[PDB]
Design the sequence.
């Protein structure tokens, strides 16, 4: 089969910067620092984005650990609640 | 014609005959009516406006020209009522003028023009086009002015507006606020000027601040007021934090004293426009290091995972005199207190020797010492003009203050408000006699209109205060009232 | 040349006139930011009052200063 | 309301209610600011109505209403009619009191309305985004306005890339 | 002896693990610039100004200056840059 044309959407951000899970102080694309160690224990699939009202991006482990003893986003002191 | 067709025609053709009358009596003469439109809407002839609207809505392409003419006329009345204002009282006059134009034209459209939605949209668009009227090659002058207006309506001024009155006034403020094109700049000034009100204790009442903050939350999205709201919901808990900190003092782990009231106002580093000081590093005065470190521990254990930065920049404190006589309660910025503390240690004060104590940049240290010597708390022992690294200082005993708790520059607002109101009356004294030098006789009610016309670009004059002020010219033998006609007036000159 | 002339309540007057200008038109702008008409304020230059053109260089060419104007009426 | 055509009928109902009442305010009661503010509060509680212990419907419903208005629909709605509706839409939109959520629902269905070409016309969304910033500020409609510009640039970048072929 | 009576100080708090950084240089916002801390620390230093613009982001003066050499937009939200708070 051949394709005459196709529309490819792409997302671009400046490579010097990157959205980061500041709780683990690592890349969103990269892993959280607590699963950076002992990485053989967990498959690290559950280290995804937890989008919410704060409109930030985090590793799920880091934000969930923060919500274990806190109740606010670690960038703005707003009531954190998962959205996506 | 409609009466005739109802009287003599079957109803199934009622609408056609009236439609066909219009397309032969008010549509084919559209050039005549549309040429008249400019005059018929410019002089606000209300009966003529009503007839014009009832006869123009019928024609298919009849309304738009009148829409455009109303938009232009409202635009002109906006500029004429919002130009060449006094720089002294610009914000209140600006907001009041826009509210007056909006109210009068809402009255005109939705009582005489029948309040068609097209006309209301024209009002909104034109008045938006005037309440962001930038000077050519200049930034828009609306956001800062409305920020100043709100910041004057919320301060504890001597006006003393009642709570219901201030709520109504702030609803009007929302009405005039929904037109500024760059609302982002507006909350950039407002956040800066809400920082002043919630850190110097100048808010009239936290109820009013909460009402205003929550009132922006329905005229703009919750994201728009997130920076604004997080300040108010941080001061309202800060006092509770002072209570909890004093309770932590009451733990009495050791014998602890602060020698000070120590009211603290921790603020959220993100949503507070207070700049994290790039320069002017500071070393805390030794009289207060213990309190600083104990507060740091209290904010550490009782609230884990938190780092402070001790923004001394805006830190305001007060200190008692060193028994120099006439005991005054001296309140200074913490920049000034440390310098004057090292001054208290020894009468001879070298600039270089106080560099070590304060541990700060000289460019604002000179400003602090200059403010100290402006009220002559400190004196320059050397007679050289400015302050160098070798400037000498000591105590100026002979300076006296009429107030013990005297103020260093940042119930006196009552006197200033009376003086401003006096100048309002003083100008009104300097407005009456000009008409007397123009026609020498005017009616009681006709004189009031000339006062407002003379003060069109100035403050709005009160009708009752005219009567009280015009009597000043009577007993001063300037002007007099005719016996036969109370409206008739004359002057001796 | 900005102006900081006081008034009956220590108010401000914005003449914005250089010392080469005449007080016949310099005082016009000073009272424009105050409220009085130009030909009504008997401006006193700390010891003397303006008359005719009254070029501002005659009054020591002071910059701003404190010109305590007289608010007498019927002067027009 | 009929759930198939809930958004447009909802907006029409609330807007006609507001219009009738605001006409009644000053044609009869001289138009005090008190009564206008009372109408504001009342219709604010009206359009915000929700089933208890459940999410609200106003942001999603008005997002879908503006999607209907800006959709390239077969009904042939003209540019003047849709722009007049949007100018009327802002009056309803002011009463939501939960606007930032509406901005999120609108933004998500703008990506659907942009890549798939379902937009009415790329010069008609400007009459919508710039009609929002004037009523909610610049940080409100900032994500939207970076999206809409990308269409009128990347497409140009298309001709700036095919030329790179040559 | 000047004895202090009351001290209405303030304090700004941020979560310690979450450090605001100049996105170009990634260093601590109160620390030196990436080129200040590596190239011009010895020469002058004390010149890594925390720039604020209409973008309202956090930047170092040298970082944003080298960013502005070949473009005009803020490298966190692609607005128009002014560094004017
Ligand atoms: Zn993480
Ligand atoms: Zn993980
Ligand atoms: Zn957040
Ligand atoms: Zn940097
Ligand atoms: Zn640098
Ligand atoms: Zn940015």
Sequence:
């Amino acid at each position: 089969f051949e394709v005459k044309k196709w529309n490819a959407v792409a997302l671009w951000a400046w490579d010097i910067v990157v959205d980061n899970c500041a709780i683990c102080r690592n890349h969103i694309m990269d892993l959280c620092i607590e699963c950076q160690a002992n990485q053989a224990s967990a498959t690290s699939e559950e280290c995804t984005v937890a989008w919410g009202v704060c409109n930030h991006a985090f590793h799920f482990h880091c934000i969930s650990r923060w919500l274990k003893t806190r109740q606010v986003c670690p960038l703005d002191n707003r009531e954190w609640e998962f959205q996506k | 014609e409609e009466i005739r067709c109802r009287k003599y025609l079957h109803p199934s053709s009622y609408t056609k005959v009236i439609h066909e009358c219009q397309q032969r009596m008010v549509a084919d003469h559209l050039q005549f009516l549309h040429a008249e439109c400019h005059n018929i809407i410019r002089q606000e002839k209300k009966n003529d406006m009503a007839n014009m609207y009832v006869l123009l809505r019928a024609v298919s392409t009849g309304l738009p020209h009148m829409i455009q003419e109303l938009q232009n006329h409202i635009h002109d009345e906006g500029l004429r009522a919002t130009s060449n204002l006094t720089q002294e009282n610009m914000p209140t006059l600006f907001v009041e003028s826009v509210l007056e134009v909006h109210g009068k034209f809402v009255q005109l459209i939705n009582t005489v023009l029948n309040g068609d939605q097209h006309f209301m949209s024209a009002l909104d668009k034109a008045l938006t086009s005037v309440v962001n009227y930038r000077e050519p090659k200049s930034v828009c002058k609306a956001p800062e002015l409305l920020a100043k207006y709100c910041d004057n309506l919320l301060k504890k001024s001597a006006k003393g507006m009642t709570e219901n009155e201030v709520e109504d006034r702030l609803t009007s403020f929302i009405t005039v606020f929904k037109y500024i094109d760059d609302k982002d700049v507006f909350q950039k000034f407002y956040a800066r000027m809400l920082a002043k009100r919630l850190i110097h204790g100048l808010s009239m009442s936290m109820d009013s601040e909460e009402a205003m903050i929550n009132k922006l939350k329905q005229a703009c999205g919750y994201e728009f007021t997130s920076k604004l709201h997080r300040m108010y919901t941080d001061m309202s808990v800060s006092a509770d934090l002072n209570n909890k900190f004093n309770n932590f003092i009451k733990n009495q782990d050791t014998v602890i004293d602060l020698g000070i009231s120590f009211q603290i106002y921790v603020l959220q580093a993100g949503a507070w426009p207070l700049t994290q000081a790039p320069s002017s590093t500071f070393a805390i005065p030794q009289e207060l290091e213990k309190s600083v470190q104990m507060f740091e521990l209290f904010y550490s254990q009782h609230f884990s995972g938190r780092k402070l930065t001790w923004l001394h920049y805006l830190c305001t404190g007060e200190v008692k005199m060193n028994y120099l006589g006439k005991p005054y309660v001296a309140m200074v910025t913490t920049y000034q207190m440390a310098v004057l503390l090292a001054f208290n240690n020894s009468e001879t004060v070298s600039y270089k020797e106080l560099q070590d104590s304060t541990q700060m940049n000289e460019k604002e240290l000179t400003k602090t010492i200059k403010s100290l010597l402006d009220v002559k708390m400190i004196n320059h022992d050397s007679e050289k003009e400015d302050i160098d690294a070798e400037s000498s200082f000591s105590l100026n005993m002979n300076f006296s203050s009429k107030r013990t708790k005297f103020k260093i520059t940042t119930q006196e607002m009552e006197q200033t408000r009376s003086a401003v109101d006096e100048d309002r009356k003083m100008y009104l004294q300097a407005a009456i006699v000009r008409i007397m030098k123009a026609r020498k006789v005017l009616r009681h009610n006709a004189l009031i209109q000339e006062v407002i016309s003379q003060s069109r670009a100035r403050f709005n004059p009160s009708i009752s205060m005219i009567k009280k002020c015009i009597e000043v010219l009577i007993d001063k033998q300037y002007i007099e009232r005719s016996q036969a006609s109370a409206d008739e007036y004359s002057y001796v000159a | 040349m900005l102006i900081k002339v006081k008034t009956l309540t220590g108010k401000e007057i914005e003449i914005d006139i250089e010392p080469t200008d005449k007080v016949e038109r310099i005082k016009e702008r000073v009272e424009e930011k105050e409220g009085i008409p130009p030909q009504q304020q008997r401006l006193i230059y700390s010891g003397k009052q303006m008359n005719d053109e009254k070029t501002a260089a005659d009054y020591k060419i002071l910059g701003g200063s404190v010109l305590h104007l007289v608010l007498a009426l019927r002067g027009g």
In short: Residues 61-67 of chain E form the longest helix (7 residues).
